[PDB]
Design a protein around this ligand. Structure first.
Ligand SMILES: Nc1ncnc2c1ncn2[C@@H]1O[C@H](COP(=O)(O)OP(=O)(O)O)[C@@H](O)[C@H]1O
Ligand SMILES: Nc1ncnc2c1ncn2[C@@H]1O[C@H](COP(=O)(O)OP(=O)(O)O)[C@@H](O)[C@H]1O
Ligand SMILES: Nc1ncnc2c1ncn2[C@@H]1O[C@H](COP(=O)(O)OP(=O)(O)O)[C@@H](O)[C@H]1O
Ligand SMILES: [Mg+2]
Ligand SMILES: [Mg+2]
Ligand SMILES: [Mg+2]
Lengths: 366, 393, 366, 359
């Protein structure tokens, strides 16, 4: 039984190969107390830090897809194997996922930790974009992976990846959460501490949506109360939000709302296709696959369909593939790959690693 | 009677101000569980991440504040450095172990580095795998122990670059750490097979051994105390970190066995022979716990715990000669973050401002008692003691 | 054998660790004769002053939790150890209790008196609100400690105290006793001397209660005599009180009766909860613990439940915990804590204090 | 003779254009019984009524009460008819566009003001310092803002807000004064504590060194006389109260201090303009009037900024009313007469005219 672990910026999905959904999904946070104990555990990880967050300092070990603290990163992995999956890491091979264009220094640490700290028998690292294509049952298409830290567009054609056309956008769910906190203060609600960041993230995951026409939705919001929703805070207080429901997701298509000089996700996807050869752009237009939790907003597929169509030539057929389980597309693709009979030759044994080093994982990987 | 009699029951830690710290230090990203820092009363050595090969940053203690990104480093190894250790009898000599399968001994100038240091004084090549364990002999001069991943223990002679002893068939699995005893005649070692071994290097014999000292599969440590006992940190079957004290004349059962918590990360014990206080710092933990080892049961008395909000990547302990005696300081720890080295001051609260005779007994000096040639013959001696009263201001 | 001493504004409780009730419970008063002796001891402390109070001037060494006289404070402690407990202070460790947000100057004097006047072997000072939580077997909840001098609301979550949310109310049993004296003169009974203050206090402890609806109760007392009760004075005279039974405790919820600007105990409790983090307000609503003798009025738990529910959101479950022995909750919690094997590390030795000073008691405490 | 009204979070500054100082400075509160008292009247009744802040955090939340304050300023404080004089209003940074239009609508329809102009408080502070590029640390009564300004335009994406200002320091001083036995709990005693804070508090260059000095001698003790003749003494509370600005953990706050907030806002700007903002840090607001706050902020930011950057903290002596004084100078200029939003323009473009005439 092989383990498939997908480490993201905000969430960590874990499970067993062959299943249809991750068995363990918990936030990738480490919380530490910020008060003094008066009544006679110095850190909390995952859902335990989420239930005690009123007295904890929540810190994300991964920021923008960059591990800011490896000591806290090992806590997430240790919590995964022993507390969530409740399995011994030394008895099951582990399949890991990595972001596209992952630095080799980052990949070596992940390989080094798995083989020396957890002593896993076998290990393999796969591209998140490729795995998301496995879950959709395709060998050709461009995957717009938008998670919690960073957004990536990876065009894949007939099983061949094009690294030169991969574009990176430093804008994801965490930036949207911080923007929602900024615009909620305009309505009189102050969310400042890290514990209230998770509250706003819950608001964003429940009441935010992408408007087909942003300017038209603004006019309706200023002349009617049909788009207003109410949310209940943990203490029972009810807050009401109006145009903030579609203003926060609008930062994806208009990064200027955050003061960013880059283009929106629609143009990043379009620019990535244009960096490919002309003979393959037609297939990438009709096989645009969305992935990650930041693509779960209602109407984002329709808006992305509209925006790219205005950019692409009129003769091209634009098709946005948004499966309803795209939030776990990376993990589902990993479980499928780890169950294939042709994948057993891709395992890197622990015995091979200590006698060869990280040179064998740079090869046999992409 | 109501309270256990002690002097360090109220020791509290206090980090120094931001202007006394060391910022902009790219601390190493190696999974090896070492201290990553070695500090003497003169310099501060921190293992840093190098673009190619391996290097560690050596800067004078007065060079506080932000460190230049182009500051010269000791970059001679072709692989990342694993362990560093200052020579007890020479404040300007530091030995470094790396995964390039060699041990390099350096000579640091009195004012520090003006240009990157690439040539070492000695290149000691006797290991076939990476060397992550380095320990100087406490008494014998120019005697250095290096233990690599090939499960071999080697005794070097730094002055003559000779191989004094080779101990290859004594550790059947990977070695966690080694620690010399008080007089440097024996050394204890913790192995991956859950066994604690006490070894006499000059005779090449196993004095004592405890199989399954700690039942956990996670890494453990084993150090020697001044009275000759063995102090070990380890894990249980339920993955719960414990503390143990072992009598070398009776290894059937531990003298003490206390559990601390169920967190990950190896516990690195820092021992102060003068105060008989053991500081246990866990890699990735944000707290430092110190215990007092006495002859009264349960032989391990919890004193207190210094807590912070930042996990530590490494830790270095300043020897007694570099402490500010006039401020009732008994330990200074240079906590390593991922990009900063924050010294932490452990001080005994005392009302009097005079020199405290009880807090500061005679400590080992920077003068070697024996030499490599004499130690080989079979001579044994205690470290030369000096007085800290001259350091009072 | 450890001693637990709970010095309150009006009443002093003492005993031994491991017991279930205080062995010595006597008022904290010092009485001095105000006449001249005609027949051939200049001060009386505790109950002996209460029996001779007809010729004495009774003074409380504590006023609003502030020591107005330390010379009289040493008399209370001397009476406790030698006359009430009949023990030697230099033989048993003493566990002391301090009010929340106790000034460091006040704590130093308690430290210095115990170690230099009584020469206790060990001493520890604990927060009264924390001890009250130990007796109820909880690590989470807000404690409203209303004694004789001052009322405190201290929220504690998972063993962590939040000092910034601690609210203080200068309204307690002594203010209610003085108010009852003021409103008893409207009925024709005049109590003015300090000796008659104790008589009115006994009336308050026996005939006063909290009305669920103050306005409805006033109408009932103005149209019926069912709420009238009789009390027998020490000289044999019988007095009858009507609406004064529930008007005196009503000052706790309406401090405007005393000309005060602050809000009632119900609003102070609610405001202290609102000062905490939003994620922990749910647990504080369901774990409101009442402590002190001023919370022993019949029907005060029902009134607090009704008042806080009107302030808190409808979705929050308000649960007021009022144990029947809450008059000694601070002491009982001290006896439990002093008997714990893990508490022996918190003792402060006399030898350690002599060489280190009051710096070590500010640490190791909260 | 134009009117300049600085709408502060806790204090409203009002006066006439061309004057050196505002004529009226009164608290911006509305009091209702526990039937409507505004300003000092709401504080004169003390405890019979409850106090509400409509602009509590620089952003207007209760427009019904905000109209009451403005009605109090024109008729009771300035003692003029608003329909005869142009009025220059000031707004906090990151003010929503809906609030700007509401202010325009109220001034032209409720007060029938002939001419109106709205300016940013942070911009006026920088202009009064003789600069067009810099970062203004506006620390007022209810809110603290660090507004980086480049070429006269504030960068909205880099503006940081801190809910730590003079109001929280006054409450903290009330809390720490009880450790000496004093008791200031009522509203009347709160104004006394605020008076103590404004006269005897100072920012220590080294807090830990200052605590040792205060605990070893009585040179830092100062005596203050209460309105009833009683005299109180304060020791280390003089520099402990303003220390909460740099150490918010004293108030149980997780947020960073004003020195880190200023540095964090600078790092959110373009890399090529950070060197100019480091050398043009201008303090503004009442809470920046503590002696020694410029030297402390200079020392703290230098520890954060790279050693090769030049840190210069600008503390003009008039920075307490720099927003209003900047408004009075600008509104009194003869050439400024053409930038007023006339009532005639309001009737044509509606409240939306403020977006194109005042940016
Ligand atoms: N239904 C939803 N609507 C909007 N955003 C969502 C939804 N579900 C998850 N998210 C956002 O997706 C982000 C991370 O999702 P995921 O793709 O799992 O990231 P990662 O790849 O880092 O694990 C979260 O920060 C969350 O805000
Ligand atoms: N049964 C009761 N009903 C009403 N009030 C009471 C009762 N018992 C005690 N009190 C009041 O409680 C006050 C002090 O009680 P206590 O909590 O012991 O105060 P302290 O904490 O100062 O010792 C006394 O002044 C008394 O008036
Ligand atoms: N001389 C002073 N020293 C310290 N603080 C002051 C001084 N003068 C005023 N303050 C504080 O400044 C605060 C309000 O000043 P101001 O900047 O006008 O606030 P706002 O701009 O929000 O109206 C008051 O709460 C007061 O405590
Ligand atoms: Mg992902
Ligand atoms: Mg009490
Ligand atoms: Mg202002």
């Amino acid at each position: 039984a092989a383990l498939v672990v997908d480490n993201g910026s905000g969430m960590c999905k874990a499970g067993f190969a062959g299943d249809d959904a991750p068995r363990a999904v918990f936030p990738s946070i480490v919380g530490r107390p910020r008060h003094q104990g008066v009544m006679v555990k110095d850190s909390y990880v995952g859902d335990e830090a989420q239930s005690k967050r009123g007295i904890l300092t929540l810190k994300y070990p991964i920021e923008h897809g960059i591990v800011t603290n490896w000591d806290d990163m090992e806590k997430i992995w240790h919590h995964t194997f022993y507390n969530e999956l409740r399995v011994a890491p030394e008895e099951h091979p582990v399949l890991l996922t990595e972001a596209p264009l992952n630095p080799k220094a980052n990949r070596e640490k992940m390989t080094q930790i798995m083989f020396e700290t957890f002593n896993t028998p076998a290990m393999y690292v796969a591209i998140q974009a490729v795995l998301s294509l496995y879950a959709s049952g395709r060998t050709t298409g461009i995957v717009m992976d938008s998670g919690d830290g960073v957004t990536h567009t990876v065009p894949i054609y007939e099983g061949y990846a094009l690294p030169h056309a991969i574009l990176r956008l430093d804008l994801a769910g965490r930036d949207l959460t911080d923007y929602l906190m900024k615009i909620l203060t305009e309505r009189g609600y102050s969310f400042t501490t890290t514990a209230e960041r998770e509250i706003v993230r819950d608001i964003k995951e429940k009441l935010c949506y992408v408007a087909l026409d942003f300017e038209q939705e603004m006019a309706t919001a200023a002349s009617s109360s049909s788009l207003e929703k109410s949310y209940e805070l943990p203490d029972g207080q009810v807050i009401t939000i109006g145009n903030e429901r579609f203003r926060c997701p609008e930062a994806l298509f208009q990064p200027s709302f955050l003061g960013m000089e880059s283009a929106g996700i629609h143009e990043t996807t379009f620019n990535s296709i244009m960096k490919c050869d002309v003979d393959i752009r037609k297939d990438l237009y009709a096989n645009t696959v969305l992935s990650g939790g930041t693509t779960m907003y209602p109407g984002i597929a329709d808006r992305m369909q509209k925006e790219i169509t205005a950019l692409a030539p009129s003769t091209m057929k634009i098709k946005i593939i948004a499966p309803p389980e795209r939030k776990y597309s990376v993990w589902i693709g990993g479980s499928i790959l780890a169950s294939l009979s042709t994948f057993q030759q891709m395992w890197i044994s622990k015995q091979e690693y200590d006698e060869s080093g990280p040179s064998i994982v740079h090869r046999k990987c992409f | 009677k109501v309270v256990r009699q002690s002097k360090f029951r109220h020791v509290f830690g206090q980090p120094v101000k931001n202007d006394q710290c060391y910022e902009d230090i790219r601390v190493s990203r190696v999974t090896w569980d070492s201290t990553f820092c070695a500090v003497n009363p003169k310099f501060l050595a921190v293992i840093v991440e190098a673009s190619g090969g391996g290097a560690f940053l050596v800067l004078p203690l007065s060079k506080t504040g932000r460190i230049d990104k182009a500051y010269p480093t000791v970059c001679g190894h072709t692989g990342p450095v694993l362990d560093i250790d200052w020579c007890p009898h020479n404040d300007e000599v530091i030995a470094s172990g790396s995964e390039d399968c060699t041990v390099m001994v350096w000579q640091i100038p009195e004012n520090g580095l003006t240009s990157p240091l690439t040539e070492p004084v000695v290149v000691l090549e006797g290991h076939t795998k990476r060397v992550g364990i380095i320990a100087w002999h406490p008494t014998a001069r120019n005697v250095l122990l290096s233990a690599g991943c090939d499960n071999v223990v080697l005794i070097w002679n730094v002055g003559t670059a000779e191989e004094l002893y080779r101990l290859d068939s004594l550790h059947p699995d990977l070695i966690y750490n080694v620690s010399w005893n008080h007089n440097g005649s024996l050394f204890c070692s913790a192995c991956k097979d859950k066994s604690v071994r006490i070894i006499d290097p000059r005779r090449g014999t196993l004095v004592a051994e405890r199989e399954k000292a700690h039942e956990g599969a996670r890494p453990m440590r084993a150090i020697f105390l001044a009275d000759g006992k063995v102090f070990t940190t380890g894990f249980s079957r339920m993955s719960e970190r414990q503390l143990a004290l072992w009598d070398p004349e009776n290894l059937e059962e531990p003298m003490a066995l206390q559990e601390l918590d169920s967190s990950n990360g190896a516990l690195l014990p820092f021992y102060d022979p003068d105060t008989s206080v053991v500081y246990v710092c866990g890699k990735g933990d944000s707290s430092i716990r110190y215990f007092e080892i006495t002859e009264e049961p349960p032989y391990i008395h919890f004193l207190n715990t210094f807590t912070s909000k930042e996990p530590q990547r490494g830790m270095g302990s300043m020897p007694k000669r570099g402490l500010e005696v006039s401020k009732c300081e008994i330990a200074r720890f240079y906590k390593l973050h991922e990009r900063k080295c924050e010294p932490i001051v452990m001080t005994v609260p005392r009302k009097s401002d005079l020199f405290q005779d009880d807090l500061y007994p005679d400590t080992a000096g920077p003068e070697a008692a024996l030499e490599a040639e004499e130690w080989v013959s079979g001579r044994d001696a205690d470290p030369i003691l000096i007085s800290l009263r001259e350091a009072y201001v």
